[PDB]
Each structure stands twice: as C-alpha cells, then as structure tokens.
C-alpha cells in the first residue's frame, strides 16, 4: 500500500512479469493466484567520482606591479612576466617633460597582476559500474533490495507471502562515456562531455591555470590605457547555459540520479496469505471512509469486530440493482488477522452507480459509490 | 606649456579666432601682436543627473517558509505573501492517507523566501541642457579655468598681466543623449541604448528596498526549495562588448570663438636682455615638429626680453619661427620656456647678444 497516493503509478497484469521502474513513479503488479505487490525505485546512487577538470568562474587581481620607460630607452621589464601566476599586458603612452621624461614621444609601459580564483567548477566522471539501485517491494496489507551491475539478480524474501527473484538490467542513464557530472557550489548537473571541454574559461587538471586570458578584460587598441582587470562572475552565465541540462541531487556523499531500471520478476515461489483461511462470519465496520485515488481506484480501511479470525474479508462490487458482480478488487484476497483488526482494500468500481458489500448476510455493510 | 607633450595637438593661426576643442586634444593659438595661448577641454560634467532604474545582478535567499494543504481544502496562506521583501510561488503535490490527508489528489502548496540584493547596477538619464564644459586656458611661460554651460555659453577670462579674452562656445554632439543611458556597474561605467537597458531581464527598482520581478533571479526548480540564479556580473560584461566605456567624462567636441581684442603681450613693455643665458633644460623635439627649451637668465637688468633667433647653416639669415610670443626673463636666475619651429635639416638657435650669446646646433630629421 505504498503506491496508492503516488501520482505517477502504472498497473501491470501478466499471465515472469515485465516491468519498468522509474524515479518519482511506482508499479503495482497483479496476477491470478499471486499477491498484489507495489514496486518502487527509491534511489540510483553513484559511490565514487573521478575529478577530470576544474574551471575558474570567479577571479581577482592582487600584487599589481608597473614598470615605465622613457622614449628611445627601450621596453621596460618585470620578473613577474616570467611568472605563470601573473597576467602581463604592454601599452605605449605619450611621454614628455610633464611626465618626467627628458625626451618626448611614445614611452613603453608594462603592468602585471597575480591571478587568483575565488569560484571554481568541477567536472567529474561517473563510472556506470559503481551504480547502486535501491528497489522497495511492498505487499498490500516494505522489503529493500539492491541492484548492482555486478549482482543484478536478487532474491527477495517476504514473510508469509513467499519469495521472488528480481532480475534487472542496469542500462539506464545516457552513455556516461559521453556524459560529465558538473558541480557548481551546491548544485550538480549531468552535461555532455564535449560541451564541458569546450567551455571558454581558465582550467586545471591538478595551482597553474591554463588560458587565464579567458577571464581577463578585452583590450581595444584605439582607446585610453586601463589597469589589468578581470571579468566579474560567470556563475549566472553558467546557470543560463544549463537551462536544458538535467539537474542531479547531491547530499552528504554520493550522487542521486533519475533512473529507468528495466526488471523481470519471478512470481513462481509467491503465495497469497489469506487463501489458507475461511470466510469471515462476523460484522465489519468502516475504520476509514472510502476515498477515490488519482488512478480511478478506491481505498477503504475495515475493522473486523466479529470472531473466528484469521479469516478472509468478503468484498464484492455489485451493480445499481445490487444483483451481479460488476467491479474488480485490486487487493489480493484481503484477510482479518485477529479481532478488532484493520484491513486496507484497493477496489476498482465501474463508472457511475455501484454498491460495495463488505460482510455476509444481514450484518453485511453496503456502501453506495459514484464514479465520475 | 600644456599641449607640448599631448599627442593630439592642433595649431591655429589668425589675426584677432575659430577653434574646435576635443577630449584628448589640445589647441595652440597664434596671432601677430597677441600672446601664444594653449586651450584644452578638461571635462564634460553633468551637475544634475536623474536615476531611471536600479537592477539587481547578485542576490541571496533566506528564511524559507512553506505551507501545505489537502486536496479540495483550498489554497494555503502565509503572512510572508503580504511582505514585499519576500518572493512567493504556488504549486500542487500528491496528497493522500499517508501524507495525513483524508482525500487523495493534488494539494496546493506555497513557498516564500527573503530576497536580498548584494550587487546592483544603476542607469542614469543624461540631459544635454545640464552639461558643464571645463576649459583650461594657459599662457606660454598653472592656467585659468573657465565654465561653458548651454545657458551661459559666453564667458570672460581674465589673465594676469596678459589682459582679457571672451570665450563664446556652442556645444556640438553627434550621438542622441535622449536615446542614451549612463550605466554604472561597481567601478566601470558605460553609455548604452535606453531601450536595451530597459529591456534587461533582471529584478529592478525606481530611485528597506522593494524589488520588482524577483523571479528573474529566483528559481523554484529542485532536482521543495528556493534557488538563487548567481552573479550576472560576467553575463553583463559579455553583453557590453560592443558598448562604449566611459570614465562624468562624456565625449563631444566643443566649438569655440575666442575674442583676442583685450589681449596684450607681457614682454613688449621690456627692453632686450644684455646678460648671459644658460640651458636649464636641454632642447628636445616634440611630436609636432617643434622644439622646446628652458633657459636660465644669469645676467642683470631683468625684467627683460629674451633674444632668440633661428639662423641657417651659415649662421647668417633668420630661417625658422618662434611659437612662444616675446619670451621674457622675470628676474635674475629666472627660468623661461620657449617653443621653436626650426626648419628641416641644419640650423643654429642663438640665445643672447654678442660673445655671451649661446649657440645651439639643431638637426631636424625630415
């Protein structure tokens, strides 16, 4: 009873069952002589991630050094020009008596500034082999199961209901050979490998920043001299470029993805707990009023106030004239465990007027139901 | 002696004068029986500017509040929805027996967050009537500041011992300021198109700050939580690639008419220097095909006229021209700046009289 109330819900009926498990959604299975089960893919977690490239999205300039020279004297030199951590640019300015030079004409200048990153983004490789799928299987009245590419088939034991084999194929997630896991401050995305490698920002693999000029302000030749300044923050520019991209959830270690795990369930060793009991003779009462779900089905809680329990709960969906059985019961053979025991039942009444009968004889509870 | 080192320099000669003053430009005026003057446009400052809009380029989210409700029960409410400092959005989620709802279906939700701006950009309206032009007029051998306003274009400039001049100017500009905005971002300033600036998809205000369209910086997307869009500083710098960067230092050439009627040459009232001269500053060629030299008058009988002549290779006839109008030596050990225009090739610059006269060889490549 975990699938009821979930918006994305698929019903699967087979007569060996084929089912597709996705994030945010869950599958309800039905089969003759087999129990009604709920299946859900809880999480797709990636254990380890290998660092590939680190881009700089925010930078600052420090240790500003300038060297000036008079005309005819040659070009000025700074030791910082040979330093890979600094950005150096040359300009040529009007010199003369007013600027402290004995000679008039164009005098050469050089400015250097230490480049420091304050905001970075990482590109990590996600290995499909290390993926772990958490599947929760619940019976109508949950047991957790793990699917790994190394151990895809798993045996799931259910108390009093038997055992099932869950053979799944971890083929989900777009080819991680062409996909990159991009991290930015607190958010994570799954982007294309080529798109990530083509980003026009300074980058490193190991601090030495390759292509720092991608973060440095553009210089126009026919304009007044300016200081060696850097571009603001590419944080917002990045968020604009990630509009189409799929956002990945990241917590306290590991990354959670949106899987699409294809499974084959073996319902051979499964048995219906309830078939071994006789019909309830006593009176029933409504514990929780019957309510319609988002799947055209109804749910009701019944309290068995009679004796002779454990016993089968008698339920039938009759027509407007209360004669023939017209509806269908989703819950596989519901039982009343003991006296004053509460039972949840999923029903599928037809469109329009119908009568849900719970119990036997005069003591039987008759509930009118309309379906729009 | 202001224009001497300036690269963009123009020489203007008349009788008693049409001149165009531009930023980075320098105008040297010459006239017979009138002093040699330097004119320069210092700044184009608008004394009263009007703020049009302030955009948010960097924001942060705080004090997140959520309120849920069951299906059919209506819409949930929060006190923060009435608060202008808060950004609220509505949606629906799956509700049922497990979520504490008696009914199944989509149940209305509302989420609010405290929006705070940490980085803003301003756009000010530039008006041509409020513009103030600062013109500095210097005499050969500090300068006198003058103000030009469209309301008061003509101005009287008094120069001690040199007389007085009338500076009648008219502001002329190509670009339309009615369609232009002065955009400021942290330390840099730009001149952008009015429509382009008003079309910017960012939160904004006019003039404890209320922000219009906070959702242009705030997303409600989750992989329930409020997400910020991050600094738009770099995105702005990318969009300003074509735009013209500004330093109150607007571009536009001021056309002027100067009245040199009341002007007089300080020096004409003195006699020629008899004593010896020495070079204070060696003679140097400028970027305008002219030369400049500082001379120290070591002799007596000052104030007196400095005797300078540009003679030929054979030291016989006067071949060159002197730019600086009748230079004088104020007192003993006084230094004088002189701008000369020697001809192409060999010439001799003679400073002084008789044997004590200083003879300087000069070769003008050209």
């Amino acid at each position: 009873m975990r699938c009821v109330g979930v918006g994305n819900r698929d019903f699967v009926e087979g007569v060996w069952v084929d089912l597709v498990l996705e994030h945010g959604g869950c599958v309800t299975t039905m089969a003759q002589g087999k129990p009604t089960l709920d299946f859900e893919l809880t999480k797709t977690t990636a254990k380890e991630v290998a660092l590939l490239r680190t881009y700089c999205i925010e930078a600052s300039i420090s240790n500003i050094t300038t060297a000036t020279r008079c005309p005819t004297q040659g070009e000025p030199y700074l030791k910082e020009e040979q330093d890979q951590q600094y950005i150096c640019r040359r300009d040529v300015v009007d010199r003369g008596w007013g600027n402290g030079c004995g000679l008039f004409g164009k005098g050469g200048v050089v400015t250097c500034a230490k480049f420091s990153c304050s905001g970075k983004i990482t590109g990590n490789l996600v290995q499909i082999e290390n993926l772990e799928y958490t599947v929760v299987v619940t019976v109508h009245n949950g047991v957790t199961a793990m699917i790994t590419p190394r151990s895809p088939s798993v045996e799931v034991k259910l108390p009093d209901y038997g055992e099932l084999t869950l053979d799944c194929e971890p083929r989900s997630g777009i080819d991680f050979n062409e996909m990159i896991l991009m991290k930015m401050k607190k958010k994570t995305w799954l982007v294309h490998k080529q798109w990530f490698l083509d980003l026009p920002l300074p980058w490193t693999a190991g601090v030495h920043w390759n292509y720092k000029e991608r973060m440095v302000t553009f210089k126009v030749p026919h304009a007044k001299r300016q200081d060696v300044t850097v571009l603001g923050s590419q944080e917002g520019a990045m968020h604009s470029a990630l509009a189409g991209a799929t956002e990945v959830d990241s917590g306290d270690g590991n990354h959670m993805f949106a899987g699409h795990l294809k499974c084959k369930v073996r319902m051979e060793k499964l048995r219906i707990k309830g078939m071994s009991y006789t019909m309830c003779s006593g009176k029933f009462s409504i514990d929780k009023e019957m309510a319609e779900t988002q799947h055209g089905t109804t749910v009701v809680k019944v309290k068995y106030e009679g004796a002779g329990a454990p016993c089968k709960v008698p339920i039938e969906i009759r027509d407007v004239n209360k004669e023939k059985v017209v509806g269908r019961i989703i819950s596989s053979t519901p039982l009343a465990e003991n006296t004053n025991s509460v039972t949840n039942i999923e029903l599928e009444p037809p469109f329009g007027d119908s009568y849900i009968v719970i119990g036997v004889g005069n003591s039987a509870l008759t509930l009118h139901w309309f379906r729009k | 002696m202001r224009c001497v080192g300036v690269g963009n320099r123009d020489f203007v000669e008349g009788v008693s004068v049409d001149l165009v003053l531009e930023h980075g430009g320098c105008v040297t005026t010459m006239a017979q029986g009138k002093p040699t003057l330097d004119f320069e446009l210092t700044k184009t400052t608008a004394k009263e500017v009007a703020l049009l809009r302030t955009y948010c380029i960097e924001a942060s989210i705080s004090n997140i509040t959520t309120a849920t409700r069951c299906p059919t029960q209506g819409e949930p409410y929060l006190k923060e929805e009435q608060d202008q400092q808060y950004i609220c959005r509505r949606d629906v989620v799956d509700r049922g027996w497990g979520n504490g709802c008696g009914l199944f279906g989509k149940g209305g939700v509302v989420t609010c967050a405290k929006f705070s701006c940490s980085g803003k950009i301003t756009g000010n309206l530039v008006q041509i009537e409020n513009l103030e032009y600062t013109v500095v007029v210097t005499v050969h051998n500090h300068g006198v500041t003058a103000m030009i306003t469209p309301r008061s274009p003509s101005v009287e400039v008094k120069l001690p011992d040199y007389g007085e001049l009338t500076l009648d100017c008219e502001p002329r500009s190509g670009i339309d300021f009615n369609e232009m905005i002065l955009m400021k971002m942290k330390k840099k300033t730009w001149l952008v198109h009015k429509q382009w600036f008003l079309d910017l998809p960012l939160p904004w205000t006019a003039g404890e700050v209320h922000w219009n369209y906070k959702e242009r910086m705030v997303t409600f997307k989750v992989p329930q939580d409020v997400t910020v869009l991050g600094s738009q500083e770099g995105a702005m710098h990318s969009a300003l690639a074509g735009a013209t960067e500004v330093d109150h230092m607007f571009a536009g050439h001021l056309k002027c008419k100067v009245r040199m009627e009341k002007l007089r040459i300080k020096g004409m009232s003195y006699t020629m220097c008899s004593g010896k001269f020495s070079i204070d500053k060696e003679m140097a060629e400028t970027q305008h095909g002219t030369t400049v030299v500082k001379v120290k008058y070591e002799g007596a009988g000052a104030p007196c006229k400095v005797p300078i002549e540009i003679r030929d290779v054979n030291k016989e006839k006067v071949v060159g021209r002197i730019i600086s109008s009748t230079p004088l030596a104020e007192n003993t050990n006084s230094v004088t700046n002189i701008e000369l225009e020697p001809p192409f090739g060999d010439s001799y610059i003679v400073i002084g009289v008789g044997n004590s006269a200083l003879t300087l060889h000069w070769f003008r490549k050209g």
């Epitope: 306290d252 959670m256 514990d287 | 309120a67 069951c70 029960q73 497990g98 504490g100 709802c101």
Partner: antibody
Amino acid sequence: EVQLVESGAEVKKPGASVKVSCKASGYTFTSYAMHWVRQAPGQRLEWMGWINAGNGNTKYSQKFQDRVTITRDTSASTAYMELSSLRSEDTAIYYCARDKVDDYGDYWFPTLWYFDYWGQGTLVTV
Amino acid sequence: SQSALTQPASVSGSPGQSITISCTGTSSDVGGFNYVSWFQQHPGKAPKLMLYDVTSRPSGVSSRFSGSKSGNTASLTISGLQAEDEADYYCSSHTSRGTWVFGGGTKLTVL
C-alpha cells in the same frame, strides 16, 4: 529493541548555553528524524524543532529559531541540541522523539505515527 | 506560553465508566489534517503514543482508548476507567506550516 538514551541533568547560570544529547539504539539512525520537545515543571509540552539525521537539514519553532541549534553525529548515532543565552524560563525537561524520514532521505511530510519512541528527558535547572 | 490546541485542564471520572477529552484546534492543524495524535504522560515518566492518525493505535495500546474528529475538534475516549489511567493527556497535530503543536494538557483524576 528500540531505545533512546538521553544525557544527564545539568545546572547552568543565566546568560550561558547548554548542550543536551540523545543516543539512538536498535534502529538505523540516518533513516529517522530527531525531534526536540521541552516541558517546564507543571506546564505543557512544547515542540522546539527537528533534525533529519540523513542529510543534516533542520526546522525550528519561531520561539526557538534564534536560540536553538540542533546538530547530529552519524558515527556515534547521537543527536545534539544547543540552547544559547538561557534564562529562568528555560528551566525545563528536554525530551527527544523519533519519526521516520521518507525512503529518498527528505523530510517533507512525517509518518502518521510520529513520536512513537521518546527519550527519558534531561532536566535543565537555571 | 499559550498553545494553539485547547484542552480542558482537569477531567474527573469514576472507575469502570467512560470519559471523553476534547482537543480544539483550527483549519490549519486539527481541522485540516489527520496528523492528530494522543499522548499519555505519567508523573515523572516520558510521554507514550496512545493514538495516531486520529483513530489508529499502536500494538501495545488497549482497545479502551478510541479517537474521533469533527471539524477543528478532536476527541479521546477512555472506556472502563482504571486507577492506572490517572495520568496527563496531550493531543498533538502537524500544522499547515509544517510544525508540531501540543495541547495545554488534561490531568485525568480517577475516583
């Protein structure tokens, strides 16, 4: 079997801070949220806030958001509750109660049977 | 500090008789959701979950304890009173704002 072991009673002076704890035993600590409820002598129970032990997320009551700080130690299966700038009014018994978190690890809606197991409470005198 | 949930301060009853404790809230808590729970608190002991989801009760809790809800008012009914029932009773609710509110408390006295 499920059990919540609370820290010993503490006597503090007004204007100081106090840190109380609750150790989880017999269940997966990360799969549950730890709530803090206080009760002054002869007074009613008053909810303070919670901590999702799985991701470290919190939610406090408007009366306690400025003074209360709830933390957790996954390695020791212990949840901590710090109350700064305590006054004579804070003289109360501090109870911890458990509630299961959703299978994904998010604590949006609680389980209908919230506070099924409680700690014996720490008496904090001022 | 005043609670959003209102309960009578004291409720008395005779042994072997039925008694009811009321818990009035608002459309934002009791009247809005089924997150209505009832707790028993003996002197010196920690609270014990008696009822949850308005009517549901944990395995160890007696059938003598029953729950009800009508509008913004929730009710706890104890049938066939015993001397051990003499304890303080609190009602709780999960609010629209995602918080938990408790009632003022009801001291049950058994004669």
